[PDB]
Amino acid sequence: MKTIGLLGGMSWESTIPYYRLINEGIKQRLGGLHSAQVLLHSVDFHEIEECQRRGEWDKTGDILAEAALGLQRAGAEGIVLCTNTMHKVADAIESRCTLPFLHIADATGRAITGAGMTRVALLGTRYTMEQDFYRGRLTEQFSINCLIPEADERAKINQIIFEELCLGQFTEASRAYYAQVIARLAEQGAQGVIFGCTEIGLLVPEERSVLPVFDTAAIHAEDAVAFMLSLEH
Amino acid sequence: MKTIGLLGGMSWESTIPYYRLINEGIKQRLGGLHSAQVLLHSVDFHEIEECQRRGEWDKTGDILAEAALGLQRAGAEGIVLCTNTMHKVADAIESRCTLPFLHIADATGRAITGAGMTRVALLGTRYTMEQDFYRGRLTEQFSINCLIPEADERAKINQIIFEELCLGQFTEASRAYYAQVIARLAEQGAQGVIFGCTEIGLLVPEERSVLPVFDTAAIHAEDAVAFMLSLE
Ligand SMILES: N[C@H](CC(=O)O)C(=O)O
Numbered sequence: 047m048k049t050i051g052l053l054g055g056m057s058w059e060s061t062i063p064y065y066r067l068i069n070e071g072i073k074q075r076l077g078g079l080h081s082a083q084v085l086l087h088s089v090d091f092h093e094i095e096e097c098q099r100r101g102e103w104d105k106t107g108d109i110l111a112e113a114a115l116g117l118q119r120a121g122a123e124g125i126v127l128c129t130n131t132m133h134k135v136a137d138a139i140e141s142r143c144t145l146p147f148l149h150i151a152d153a154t155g156r157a158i159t160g161a162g163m164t165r166v167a168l169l170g171t172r173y174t175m176e177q178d179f180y181r182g183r184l185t186e187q188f189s190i191n192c193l194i195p196e197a198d199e200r201a202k203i204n205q206i207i208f209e210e211l212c213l214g215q216f217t218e219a220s221r222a223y224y225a226q227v228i229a230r231l232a233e234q235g236a237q238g239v240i241f242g243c244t245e246i247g248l249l250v251p252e253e254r255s256v257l258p259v260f261d262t263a264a265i266h267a268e269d270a271v272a273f274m275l276s277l278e279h
Numbered sequence: 280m281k282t283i284g285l286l287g288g289m290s291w292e293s294t295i296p297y298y299r300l301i302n303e304g305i306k307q308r309l310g311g312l313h314s315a316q317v318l319l320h321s322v323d324f325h326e327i328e329e330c331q332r333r334g335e336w337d338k339t340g341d342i343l344a345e346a347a348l349g350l351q352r353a354g355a356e357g358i359v360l361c362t363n364t365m366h367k368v369a370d371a372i373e374s375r376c377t378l379p380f381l382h383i384a385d386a387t388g389r390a391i392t393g394a395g396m397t398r399v400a401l402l403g404t405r406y407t408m409e410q411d412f413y414r415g416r417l418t419e420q421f422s423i424n425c426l427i428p429e430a431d432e433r434a435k436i437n438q439i440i441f442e443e444l445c446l447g448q449f450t451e452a453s454r455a456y457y458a459q460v461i462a463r464l465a466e467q468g469a470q471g472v473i474f475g476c477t478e479i480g481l482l483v484p485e486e487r488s489v490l491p492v493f494d495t496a497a498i499h500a501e502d503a504v505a506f507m508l509s510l511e
């Protein structure tokens with residue numbers, strides 16, 4: 047198998063599902079006590095998230111490209127970045143590191159394509175929802191359009207991510223609020239919902255969503271397993 | 280903080296608690312959204328475990344020493360081996376990688392010392408229970424003596440580790456069996472019990488053990504946090 051390099055700790059709460067699912071996928075396919083060959087570089091999220099709020103995106107590109115290059119020196123054969131928001135600076139990593147880069151929005155776009163959908167809801171950080179880097183890629187490569195919440199809803203969704211989910215707090219009032227935003231976007235013709243922040247899956251069970259769920263962390267994980275075994279890749 | 284290098288995937292089920300606890304420790308000490316600087320090399324456990332059963336220990340030393348050097352090349356400043364059994368080949372890692380090596384049995388020995396005990400029960404793989412690499416260090420470094428289960432019990436404790444815990448199955452039948460072995464070693468004057476395989480605490484809650492519990496994975500993770508912050 048190929049050794050996968052994970053860029054994680056953004057937040058560490060969502061890096062655990064990647065590790066679990068990549069190990070479970072290798073176990074499923076190879077059997078017995080086989081487990082995944084993983085290299086993980088976990089950052090101090092404070093530096094990353096503070097740079098987000100200050101718009102210091104180039105600095106985060108420098109941090110993440112250096113991290114990927116370090117994993118390449120340790121034997122990584124491909125790169126998974128364990129965060130939707132930081133794909134804003136994917137080109138920094140892809141430029142500077144020759145390893146295959148498994149883009150999270152490509153894996154999600156293939157999943158939504160397979161479901162026959164072209165109009166979906168997108169939940170994520172405010173940056174992922176409002177800016178062009180993520181949605182523009184779904185439009186340009188897959189002709190997938192994203193509906194996003196209203197300004198007030200986006201503020202609260204984002205607040206819950208950074209003040210609760212990234213600190214391991216999963217509350218029912220926030221779970222219900224997320225479910226309520228999903229149902230409202232369903233009323234707008236959304237055919238499914240992208241959990242486009244990797245922590246959202248930890249808060250909202252699929253049972254609480256009235257729309258079919260595309261969990262980006264799970265999808266990305268499965269994409270990594272396919273790359274490691276040269277399937278589907 | 281110093282970047283910690285973790286040698287994990289032995290099994291991956293017990294590498295998660297290291298990651299969780301080291302991040303929670305950093306969060307508690309630095310606050311806010313701070314998280315741990317971690318480099319992890321997770322192995323394919325099959326190669327390691329098959330080697331255990333064949334007695335191919337030198338090959339595992341080669342694998343883990345090469346992994347530690349790879350993490351050194353990525354920026355790790357200390358090494359944590361996330362497995363009690365594989366400290367049998369700690370010296371291969373330390374002779375090859377100059378990074379500080381945080382020995383799991385030293386962390387556990389300090390904890391047991393702190394609770395004033397010198398006679399404890401040891402559960403672990405059959406290699407950890409029966410051989411001298413682990414118990415010998417606790418005796419020599421800390422004057423701590425380990426009681427271990429009887430042969431039939433060691434067989435079953437070990438079977439549960441590799442056929443159940445390392446595959447993510449945590450049964451009540453096996454939980455009860457471990458609790459019974461712990462009570463039996465308590466009757467023998469054990470003052471606490473070492474969970475000396477990192478998966479055991481995934482199966483046996485503390486409230487299950489009739490003896491005070493030294494969870495090696497937790498104690499090791501706390502040792503890692505102290506090293507990363509230059510603390511204890
Ligand atoms: N977990 C990250 C959060 C972040 O990078 O801000 C995401 O999926 O967007």
Ligand SMILES: N[C@H](CC(=O)O)C(=O)O
Binds near residue numbers: 289328363364477
């Ligand atoms: N988790 C490991 C098991 C192994 O290495 O076989 C231990 O603590 O012993």
